[PDB]
Design an enzyme around this catalytic site. Structure first.
Site, PDB file in Angstrom:
ATOM      1  N   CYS A 129       0.829  -1.202   0.000  1.00 27.87           N
ATOM      2  CA  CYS A 129       0.000   0.000   0.000  1.00 27.87           C
ATOM      3  C   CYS A 129       0.870   1.262   0.000  1.00 27.87           C
ATOM      4  O   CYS A 129       0.365   2.350  -0.280  1.00 27.87           O
ATOM      5  CB  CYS A 129      -0.949  -0.019   1.197  1.00 27.87           C
ATOM      6  SG  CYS A 129      -1.584  -1.661   1.625  1.00 27.87           S
TER       7      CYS A 129
ATOM      8  N   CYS B  10     -13.820  -0.242   7.059  1.00 30.93           N
ATOM      9  CA  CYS B  10     -12.836  -0.604   6.039  1.00 30.93           C
ATOM     10  C   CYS B  10     -12.854   0.367   4.881  1.00 30.93           C
ATOM     11  O   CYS B  10     -13.912   0.598   4.300  1.00 30.93           O
ATOM     12  CB  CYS B  10     -13.078  -2.027   5.547  1.00 30.93           C
ATOM     13  SG  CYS B  10     -13.370  -3.216   6.868  1.00 30.93           S
ATOM     14  N   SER B  11     -11.666   0.657   4.348  1.00 25.13           N
ATOM     15  CA  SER B  11     -11.546   1.321   3.058  1.00 25.13           C
ATOM     16  C   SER B  11     -11.937   0.360   1.947  1.00 25.13           C
ATOM     17  O   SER B  11     -11.801  -0.856   2.097  1.00 25.13           O
ATOM     18  CB  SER B  11     -10.117   1.812   2.836  1.00 25.13           C
ATOM     19  OG  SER B  11      -9.165   0.769   2.956  1.00 25.13           O
TER      20      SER B  11
ATOM     21  N   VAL C 227     -11.895  -1.351  -2.044  1.00 25.56           N
ATOM     22  CA  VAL C 227     -11.004  -1.605  -3.167  1.00 25.56           C
ATOM     23  C   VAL C 227     -11.348  -0.604  -4.240  1.00 25.56           C
ATOM     24  O   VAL C 227     -12.528  -0.335  -4.456  1.00 25.56           O
ATOM     25  CB  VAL C 227     -11.163  -3.039  -3.703  1.00 25.56           C
ATOM     26  CG1 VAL C 227     -10.178  -3.296  -4.836  1.00 25.56           C
ATOM     27  CG2 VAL C 227     -10.982  -4.056  -2.588  1.00 25.56           C
TER      28      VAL C 227
ATOM     29  N   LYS D 114     -10.633   5.688   3.752  1.00 30.92           N
ATOM     30  CA  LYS D 114     -11.963   5.185   4.062  1.00 30.92           C
ATOM     31  C   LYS D 114     -13.014   5.726   3.087  1.00 30.92           C
ATOM     32  O   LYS D 114     -13.676   4.947   2.407  1.00 30.92           O
ATOM     33  CB  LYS D 114     -12.349   5.507   5.510  1.00 30.92           C
ATOM     34  CG  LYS D 114     -13.740   5.031   5.857  1.00 30.92           C
ATOM     35  CD  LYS D 114     -13.881   3.526   5.681  1.00 30.92           C
ATOM     36  CE  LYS D 114     -15.318   3.132   5.823  1.00 30.92           C
ATOM     37  NZ  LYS D 114     -16.063   3.693   4.681  1.00 30.92           N
TER      38      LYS D 114
ATOM     39  N   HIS E 258      -9.098   3.973  -1.710  1.00 31.70           N
ATOM     40  CA  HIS E 258      -7.753   3.443  -1.520  1.00 31.70           C
ATOM     41  C   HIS E 258      -7.289   2.715  -2.776  1.00 31.70           C
ATOM     42  O   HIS E 258      -7.596   1.538  -2.942  1.00 31.70           O
ATOM     43  CB  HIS E 258      -7.719   2.503  -0.304  1.00 31.70           C
ATOM     44  CG  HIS E 258      -6.350   2.018   0.049  1.00 31.70           C
ATOM     45  ND1 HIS E 258      -5.215   2.617  -0.466  1.00 31.70           N
ATOM     46  CD2 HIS E 258      -5.975   1.108   0.972  1.00 31.70           C
ATOM     47  CE1 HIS E 258      -4.190   2.014   0.114  1.00 31.70           C
ATOM     48  NE2 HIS E 258      -4.598   1.077   0.961  1.00 31.70           N
TER      49      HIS E 258
END
Ligand SMILES: CC(C)(COP(=O)(O)OP(=O)(O)OC[C@H]1O[C@@H](n2cnc3c(N)ncnc32)[C@H](O)[C@@H]1OP(=O)(O)O)[C@@H](O)C(=O)NCCC(=O)NCCS
Ligand SMILES: CC(C)(COP(=O)(O)OP(=O)(O)OC[C@H]1O[C@@H](n2cnc3c(N)ncnc32)[C@H](O)[C@@H]1OP(=O)(O)O)[C@@H](O)C(=O)NCCC(=O)NCCS
Ligand SMILES: [Cl-]
Ligand SMILES: [K+]
Ligand code: NA
Ligand SMILES: [Zn+2]
Ligand SMILES: [Zn+2]
Lengths: 347, 392, 129, 347, 392, 128
Positions: free
Chosen positions: E85, E206-207, E209, E332, E336
Site C-alpha cells: 500500500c 474498512c476502506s 477496493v 476510508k 484506496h
C-alpha cells in the site's frame, strides 16, 4: 519370540448427526431405522479434517501410550477406504507428522473395512521376524454414504492406531495368534471413477459378512484351541448393530462379552477404523489377563481374526491419552443441511 | 552529486537450489557482501532489492519488508525496484542515487530470484512482454527473441553457425566459474543439434530459469577509503538508464535495442571515455542474438559486423587486442536469476577490475581499467548501463 | 508444492530454533538471528503445541474456498515458549476470548483446487480443562 | 539366511507403441525424446487386460517356478497405482485365481511406484516371524500417461510376482537385508477425483527421486557394511533410462552391473512392476552366488532397498515359466489411434 | 544534497472506474499534473512509479516500460517501486532522492492501480501479508487489522463507539471532495450496524477496493522558480522510510507501528520541527484503527488516548486548536488505490499548504505552514513519511 | 476478465485510430500519439486485414494449452496501413517466409480453462 501391542490410540471427530435428522429429510420413520440398524447417531468430520488428520491424531495418541520415541518406528501402515490422495500416500504424511521419518517403510492399505487389521498383521510379521523394532498400523476413514441410501445412516469418521513391539516389559497386550479367511466376493465395491459405492443388497449379509466373519472366528479358535467360554471380551465388524450382535450371539457370546466392542449405535460405521476403535475401547476397560477375540471384515471378501491377552502394563497407559469413550461423548450435533455442507455432498 | 564506489560483493551459486530457500539465498548473498565490504550490519543505512517475479513466483508482494525483517536489519528502509530482467541493475542505480544524494552513506543493492518454486516459469517470464498484444496471441519469450534473430539474419546475413559460437565461448568460460549453473563444455554441433525451443533458437541458445541471489555494497567515495584499501575499491563512473517500446512489434528497428544505445552513449559521455577503452563487459545474453546485438549497441562494433567478427576469435581471454565480454558464462552458462542478474553482472566487473582471487582462472587483461555492464528488461523496453573503473 | 515441502516440519510438528547466546526461542525457525546476527548459535527446538490466545478476529466474509468454515476464528496465539503464530481456532465464535489456553492440532489447512496438493498444518483447539 | 525368494514370475502384454508414433501426433521430434528419455517404445495392454489379469499371469508364472501348491500361500499382496476397483481388492482376485483361497490374508497396496516392493517386505516379515509359510508379493500396473504429456512416452503395462519362503532347498535367492527411506514429498500425486496425475516437473528429479534412491542405496550398504564392488548386479527405479543410469553411475556401478535391470527403453515405466520386472530379468540371467542390489522409488517419497544373493537352485527354475526378456520380445506394434482406442483415452 | 520541491499534482477520480482503461488513468493523472506543473513532457528527465498489484489482476510485469512507451516519453528512464500500500510514497521518495543527487532536475512520481478487472481482489491485497505464515492459515487483511483493533481495545479500553467516530468524520470530510469514491454522510449507528467483515470491524470501518491514479512533479527548489510562482511552490523538507516485521505476530507491540515512530521522528529531526507545529496530516486509515494508531505514532497524542481525541472531535476541520487529519475523505471515504494512495496523500498536503482552489471547501487552517504524510505497506512492515512546508 | 471486454473491437474488427495531424495510422488504438502527444487528435479507423510477414518464428515447446497447435507459426505482420502486430499464422511451417502476404481471420485465440471465458481475435492466413 512374543509379539504384542505396546501402544494404542484413537480419534473421533466432534460432530454428530442423529438418524432423526437424516430420516426427516428423506421421508422415513426414524424409529424404524433405529430399531432395524441398531444405530442412533454417527460421527461427522469437520471440513478441515480427513483420514490423514484422523490417522495423525490416533497415531499421536498411540505414541503417548507407548511412551517411545517415534524415531524407533520402523514402518507406518494406514488402512483406509478414503485416503485423501489416489496416489500420494497418507502413511507418509502420518510418518512425517509423528517424526518417524526418514528411516522407515510405509504403505497405504486398501481392503474395504479390513485394511486396518491387515496392517496389524504386517507389523506383527516385521516385528516378529526382527526386521523392525516397532511398527505402527492405523485404521482410519471418513466414510461416505449416498444421500438417499441407508448407508447414510451409518457411514462415519474415525480412527485408531496400534504400535507393535517384541519386548514383554513394554507390551500392554500379547498376540496369541492370528487367522484370515479370504475369497473373491462381489458383495460391495466401488469402481475407480465413482465417488459413491454400489452394493448387492441382501447378498451383503449372510453370504458375505457372516460367511467370512464366522469362518474366521471358527478358524482362529481351532488354531488356538479355544471356545467362546475362553474369551473375556469380543469385537466384530459392525456395519450396523444388527449384524454385530447376530454374529456374537451366533458364536455364543453374552452381552457382557461383546458390549465394549460395539460402538456403532453412537459412532456409526468407521469402516477401516471400526474394529480398531472397538478393540481400543475394550483395552480402555480391560483388566490384566483378559482374553480378547477380534474379527474384522472387508467387502471384497476378507476377515482377520486376533487372539489377544491383556498384560499388567495396561492400567499404566490407558490414561496417557484420550479414552475412546471420552472422544465419543465429547460431541456437537448438526442438522442435515450442515452435514451435507461439511461433507461436500453439495454440488 | 558525490562519487559512489563498490566496497563489497557477495553471491550464491546460480541454479536449481531446492534446499536453499528464498531466505537462505538473500542471507548468503548479503552476509557474503558484508564480509567483503568489511562493514557491520548496523552500518547499512538502506537497502534496495531487485525482484522481477515477486508475487507471481511465490504469491508474495511487499518482499522488501520481508527481506529486511529476515535480514534482521529493521528498521532500516528497504525498497523493491522492478524492471523485469533488469531489476538488479535498477536497484543498483537506485542505491547509487541515494548515496550520491547524501541521504545514505552505505547502501546495499541486492537481487534475488526463486523460480524453481512454481510448476511453470514460462507464464511469469512472459509477464515482461505485453500481455494484451504479445503474450495473449501466443508469443513466448524465446519466440520474441527468435523473431529478432530471424530479422537480424535477414538484414545482416548472420548464419546459425556464427550465432552458435557465442554459446560455445560462454560454456567454455563458465567452467572457470564455481558460481555458474553449467560447468561443462560444448561444441558447435551440440549447440545446433540441441532440442529446438523457437526456430531458429535451440535449447543451447537460451539461458535457463534459475534460483540465485547476489548483493553489492555501494559507498561514498570519501567514506570508501575509510572502510577499504584504495586497491580493492572500484568506482562507479556512470549509472544510466533508458526506455524503449514494451512490444517488439512497436520498435522502429528490431535488430537494435535503442535504449542500450541511448544508455551506453550517455555512460560514455559522463566517463569521458570511448568504447575502445573498455577492457571487460557483461551483457544480457539471455539469448545468443541479444549478446551480439548488445556488442554492437555498446559500440564495440558496427551494426551487422559483430556477427561476422564474433567468429574466428575475439571476445576471449585468449584475444589480446579486443574487449572481453561475459568472462563468466554470462546469463547463458552462469545462469539467469532475473532480479539478481543485474547485480551479478556488476559484481563480475568489480572482481575483474579488482583482479580478485574469485576470477583468477577467468581473469581478463585489463589495460585501461574500465568495464561496462548492459542489463536488459524484457525484449529491450528497459536497459540499464553501469560503467566501472579502478580509478576515480 | 515446493514451498509447502520446505516448511513441513514447522507446520506439522512446530519445530523452531533456539539461540544459545540469547536463550530465546524462535518459531518459525530463522536463518539469521535478529539480535545477535552471525554471533547467534542456532539449534533445532521442538515446541509444545500449547499456547494462549493473544488476540483474535471472526472472519464473516472470507474467500470462496473457506465457504464451509464461515464464520471462522482467526487468532494470534502466544505459545508457552514465547513465539506468536497466526492460525485458525476450532471453536464456537461465542466461546473465543483473549487468554484462552489452546493446543495445536494437525488439520487440513488448504487444497490447491480439485487436482492440486493438499496442505496440512496447525490449527488451535481449546484445552478440555 | 532365514528368508528368501522361492519363486518369481512376470508378465508383459504384447502390444507396443514406438515413441515415433506418439511424437508424430503431437508435433515433437522423436529422436530428441528418445535421446532425452532413453526410451524407444513401451508396452500397451489389450483392452481385455488390466492390473488384475497382469498380476494373475505373473502370479501363476511364479507358482510354476516355485513348484509349490498355492494352498500353502498364506498372504497375497498386490501393489499397484491402477487397481481396477477403488474398493474391491485385486489381491483377492489373484488369490482366487491361483487357488490360494480361503486360508490366507491379503491387501491392496498403494505407494506410487514403490507399492510392489512394499509387499515384498511384508511377506519377508510374515514368513520370517513364522506367521505364514509362503507369502506372495506382486507389483503390477497399467499406467496411463496424459495424452499431451511426456509421461505418455513411458507410462506402460507390466507386472512381476515373488513368492517368499523359508526352505533352503526351495530358495533360489536369499535376503541379506532390507532398508527403507521415507519422507513426505509433493513431487507427484493424483487426487481421488482426477483420472490423470499432476507432477512438479523438475522438482521430481534431484530433490525426490535421487534423494530417496541414493539415500536408500547408501543406507542398505551401510547396514550390510558393503560397497559397490561387492554387488554383481543392480536394479533401480526407471521412470526413464536417464534417471536410472545417472543413479547407477553416481553410485559407481558399471554398465555390466546395471544393464539387466534396465528395461524401460523397450518396455516403458510399469510403475509398481518396474523394479520387480527388472529384478526378474536379473534373476533370469544370474549365476549362483550373485549379489543383487535392488532399490525402488515411490512418489509421495519412499524407497525400498534390497540385498539379495542368488542360490544353486536358480537355473533349475528359470525355464519353468516365460523369461522376462521373451515376453518383452513377443510383441505387436500399434499406431496411436489404436493405442488411444485400447486405453479408453477416447471420450 | 539539493532541496526538492513539488511544482504540480494531478489526480484521477477514485473508485469503481469501469469506463477508464488502464492507459487512460495514467494519462489522465499525468496530463493533469503536467498542466498544474506547467512543464512540457520533454522537460521530464525521469519517471518513478510504484505499483503493489504489478498486474496481479492484469498479469503484466514491466509496467514502467509499458507506461513510458504509451506516454510517448521514450527513451526517458522509468522505474517501478514496490512496497504494498506504500508503493506511492516510495515512488515519491525515490523521485526526491534522484533530484537531490543532481542526476535529474524534473522527475514525475506517479501511482496507478486497477483492481476492478479481477473478480476477487481479496487474494491480491493479502499478498502484502506473509503468505507462508498468515495468508496460508486464512488470515485476511481485514482480520489482521481487526486483531490489532482488538488488542488495542484490550490494552487501552477503546470502545466500538469511539472507533466508529473516526468513520463519520472521514465521510463528512469526503463530501467536500470531488475526487472521493464516497460523497455521502453517515451516522454512528450506520457504521456499527453495517455488515461485518471481521469482528470487531464492519464494512464501514474498512476502506474499499478502488481504481485510480495520481502523479506529482518534483523539481529542484532553485529550478522550481522557472516553472511556477513562489507562492505555489511547496517544499519537501524530508522524506523518511523505516521497516518493521512483515507479520503482525512478530511485532514487539501490535498496538503500535514502530516503523512510523522511527520514520516520523527522523522526519521531525531533519525539519527541526515538533509534532505540535503540524497543521495538517494525511494518515493511512485503511481500517480506522490504523488512523488512531498513526495519530499516536506521529506524536499528536500519547499512546491510548486516541479514542478521546476523536470522540471529542479534535481532528475535525472545524476544530482550531489541533492538527487536522485526513481533510480529504482519506482511504476510508476518498478511496484506496494501493499504488496511487501514497502519492495522493502528499498531493493533498500540497493543496492544503498552498491553499489551492481544489480544497476550498475542506481547507484546513494553516498556522505554521507544515504538513506530514504517513503511508503504510501491509500491517506496518513498511512506513514512508513525507514532511512538507510552504517555506524552504 | 474485463480486459478482454475493452479491446474487443480491436481484436475482432481491427479498429485502430488515425492521426489527422500526421495522417499516419496506429494499431492498437492509442490514447496519446507518440509524435504529437498532446497537440494531436484521434479518429477511429478500420484497417484492412491485409499485411505481410515482417518476421516469424516456429514455437516447438509452448504452454500446455497450445498442445494441439504445436508446432505453430508466431509472426510479426506489417499491415498495409503501416502498424505491425504479432499474431499466429495458419500455414505449414515449411511454407512461411518473410514477405508473405497474409489476411486476418477471426479465430478462437485462447480460453480460461474449461470453465472460464473464451477469447477470440485475429490470426493470419496466407492469400491464394
Ligand atoms: C526452455 C527450457 C524450459 C527447456 O525445456 P526444459 O523443460 O527445461 O527441459 P529439461 O529441463 O527437461 O532439459 C533437460 C536438461 O537440459 C538442461 N538445461 C535446461 N535448460 C538449459 C539451458 N538453457 N541451457 C542448457 N542446458 C539446459 C537441464 O540441466 C537438463 O540436464 P540433463 O538432462 O542433461 O541432466 C529451459 O531451457 C528454460 O527454462 N529456459
Ligand atoms: C460487501 C463487500 C463485498 C462490498 O461489495 P458488495 O458485496 O457488492 O456489497 P455492497 O456493494 O452492496 O456494499 C454496500 C454499499 O456500500 C458500498 N461500499 C463498497 N465498499 C464499501 C466500504 N468499504 N465502505 C462503505 N461502503 C462501501 C457499495 O458500493 C454499496 O453501495 P450501493 O448499495 O449504493 O450499491 C465488501 O465486503 C467489500 O468489498 N469490502
Ligand atoms: Cl553483523
Ligand atoms: K485407491
Ligand atoms: Na480394497
Ligand atoms: Zn540472538
Ligand atoms: Zn501524431
Amino acid at each position: 519370540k512374543d509379539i504384542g501391542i505396546v501402544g494404542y490410540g484413537s480419534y473421533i471427530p466432534k460432530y454428530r448427526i442423529k438418524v432423526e435428522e437424516i430420516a426427516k429429510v428423506w421421508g422415513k420413520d426414524p424409529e424404524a431405522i433405529k430399531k432395524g440398524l441398531v444405530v442412533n447417531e454417527k460421527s461427522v468430520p469437520s471440513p478441515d479434517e480427513d483420514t490423514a488428520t484422523i490417522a495423525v491424531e490416533a497415531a499421536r495418541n498411540a505414541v503417548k501410550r507407548a511412551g517411545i520415541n517415534a524415531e524407533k518406528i520402523g514402518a507406518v501402515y494406514v488402512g483406509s477406504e478414503s485416503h485423501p490422495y489416489a496416489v500420494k500416500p497418507t502413511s507418509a504424511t502420518v510418518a512425517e507428522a509423528i517424526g518417524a521419518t526418514p528411516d522407515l517403510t510405509a504403505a497405504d492399505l486398501e481392503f474395504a473395512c479390513k485394511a486396518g487389521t491387515a496392517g496389524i498383521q504386517m507389523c506383527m510379521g516385521l516385528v516378529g521376524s526382527g526386521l523392525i523394532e516397532y511398527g505402527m498400523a492405523i485404521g482410519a476413514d471418513t466414510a461416505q454414504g449416498a444421500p438417499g441410501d441407508a448407508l447414510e445412516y451409518t457411514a462415519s469418521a474415525g480412527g485408531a492406531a496400534y504400535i507393535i513391539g517384541n519386548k514383554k516389559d513394554e507390551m500392554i497386550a500379547v498376540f496369541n495368534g492370528t487367522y484370515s479367511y479370504t475369497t473373491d466376493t462381489p458383495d460391495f465395491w466401488r469402481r475407480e471413477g465413482q465417488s459413491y459405492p454400489k452394493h448387492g443388497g441382501r447378498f451383503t449379509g449372510e453370504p458375505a459378512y457372516f460367511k467370512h466373519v464366522l469362518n474366521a472366528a471358527k478358524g482362529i479358535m481351532e488354531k488356538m484351541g479355544t471356545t467362546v467360554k475362553d474369551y473375556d471380551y469380543c469385537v466384530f465388524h459392525q456395519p450396523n448393530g444388527k449384524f454385530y450382535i447376530k454374529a456374537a450371539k451366533s458364536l455364543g457370546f453374552t452381552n457382557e462379552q461383546y458390549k465394549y466392542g460395539l460402538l456403532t449405535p453412537y459412532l456409526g460405521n468407521t469402516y477401516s477404523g471400526a474394529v480398531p476403535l472397538g478393540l481400543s475401547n475394550i483395552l480402555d476397560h480391560a483388566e490384566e489377563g483378559a482374553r480378547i477375540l477380534a474379527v474384522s471384515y472387508g467387502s471384497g471378501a476378507g476377515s482377520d481374526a486376533f487372539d489377544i491377552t491383556v498384560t499388567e502394563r495396561i492400567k499404566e497407559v490407558v490414561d496417557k491419552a484420550p479414552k475412546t469413550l471420552d472422544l465419543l461423548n465429547r460431541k456437537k450435533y448438526i442438522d442435515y443441511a450442515v452435514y451435507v455442507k461439511y461433507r461436500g455432498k453439495i454440488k | 552529486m558525490r562519487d559512489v564506489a563498490i566496497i563489497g560483493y557477495g553471491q550464491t551459486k546460480f541454479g536449481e537450489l531446492w534446499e536453499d530457500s528464498f531466505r537462505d539465498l538473500i542471507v548468503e548473498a548479503g552476509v557474503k557482501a558484508i564480509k567483503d565490504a568489511n562493514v557491520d550490519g548496523g552500518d547499512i543505512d538502506a537497502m534496495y532489492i531487485g525482484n522481477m517475479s515477486g508475487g507471481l513466483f511465490v504469491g508474495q508482494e511487499h518482499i522488501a519488508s520481508l527481506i529486511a525483517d529476515h535480514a534482521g536489519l529493521n528498521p532500516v528502509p528497504c525498497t523493491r525496484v522492478e524492471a523485469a530482467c533488469a531489476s538488479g541493475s535498477l536497484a543498483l542505480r537506485s542505491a547509487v542515487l541515494s548515496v550520491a544524494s547524501g541521504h545514505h552513506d552505505v547502501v546495499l543493492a541486492g537481487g534475488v530470484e526463486k523460480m524453481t518454486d512454481v510448476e511453470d516459469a514460462t507464464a511469469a517470464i512472459a509477464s515482461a512482454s505485453d500481455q494484451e498484444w504479445e503474450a495473449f496471441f501466443g508469443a513466448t519469450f524465446p519466440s520474441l527473441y527468435a523473431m529478432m534473430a530471424r530479422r537480424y539474419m535477414y538484414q545482416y546475413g548472420l548464419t546459425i553457425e556464427e550465432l552458435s559460437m557465442w554459446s560455445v565461448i560462454a560454456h567454455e568460460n563458465a567452467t572457470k566459474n564455481k558460481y555458474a549453473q553449467f560447468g561443462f563444455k560444448t561444441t558447435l554441433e551440440q549447440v545446433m543439434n540441441a532440442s529446438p525451443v523457437a526456430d531458429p533458437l535451440t535449447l543451447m541458445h537460451c539461458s535457463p530459469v534459475s534460483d540465485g541471489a547476489s548483493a553489492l555494497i555501494v559507498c561514498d567515495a570519501d567514506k570508501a577509503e575509510e572502510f577499504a584499501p584504495k586497491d580493492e575499491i572500484i568506482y562507479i563512473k556512470a549509472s544510466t538508464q533508458a526506455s524503449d517500446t514494451i512490444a517488439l512489434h512497436d520498435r522502429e528497428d528490431m535488430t537494435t535495442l535503442n535504449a542500450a544505445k541511448v544508455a551506453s552513449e550517455k555512460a560514455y559521455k559522463l566517463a569521458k571515455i570511448a568504447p575502445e577503452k573498455i577492457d571487460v563487459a557483461e551483457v544480457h545474453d539471455c539469448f545468443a542474438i541479444n549478446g551480439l546485438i548488445l556488442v554492437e549497441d555498446l559500440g564495440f562494433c558496427k551494426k551487422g559486423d559483430a556477427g561476422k567478427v564474433i567468429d574466428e576469435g575475439k571476445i576471449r581471454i585468449d584475444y589480446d587486442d579486443f574487449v572481453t565480454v561475459n568472462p563468466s558464462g554470462g546469463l547463458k552458462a552462469a545462469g539467469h536469476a532475473l532480479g539478481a542478474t543485474g547485480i551479478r553482472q556488476v559484481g563480475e566487473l568489480y572482481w575483474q577490475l579488482k583482479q580478485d582471487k574469485e576470477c583468477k582462472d577467468r581473469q581478463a587483461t585489463i589495460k585501461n581499467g574500465y568495464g561496462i555492464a548492459a542489463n536488459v528488461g524484457g525484449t529491450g523496453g528497459t536497459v540499464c548501463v553501469h560503467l566501472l573503473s579502478d580509478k576515480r | 508444492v515446493v514451498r509447502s515441502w520446505r516448511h513441513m516440519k514447522e507446520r506439522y510438528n512446530l519445530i523452531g530454533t533456539r539461540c544459545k547466546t540469547c536463550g530465546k526461542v524462535y518459531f518459525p525457525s530463522r536463518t539469521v538471528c535478529p539480535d545477535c546476527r552471525r554471533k547467534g548459535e542456532l539449534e533445532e527446538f521442538q515446541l509444545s503445541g500449547k499456547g494462549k490466545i493473544y488476540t483474535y478476529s471472526i472472519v464473516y466474509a472470507p474467500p470462496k474456498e473457506f465457504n464451509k468454515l464461515t464464520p471462522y476464528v482467526i487468532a494470534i496465539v502466544e505459545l508457552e515458549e514465547g513465539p506468536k503464530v497466526t492460525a485458525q481456532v476450532d471453536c464456537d465464535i461465542n466461546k473465543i476470548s483473549i487468554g484462552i489456553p489452546v493446543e495445536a492440532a494437525f488439520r487440513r489447512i488448504k487444497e490447491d483446487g480439485k487436482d492440486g496438493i493438499i496442505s496440512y498444518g496447525y490449527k488451535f483447539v481449546p484445552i478440555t480443562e
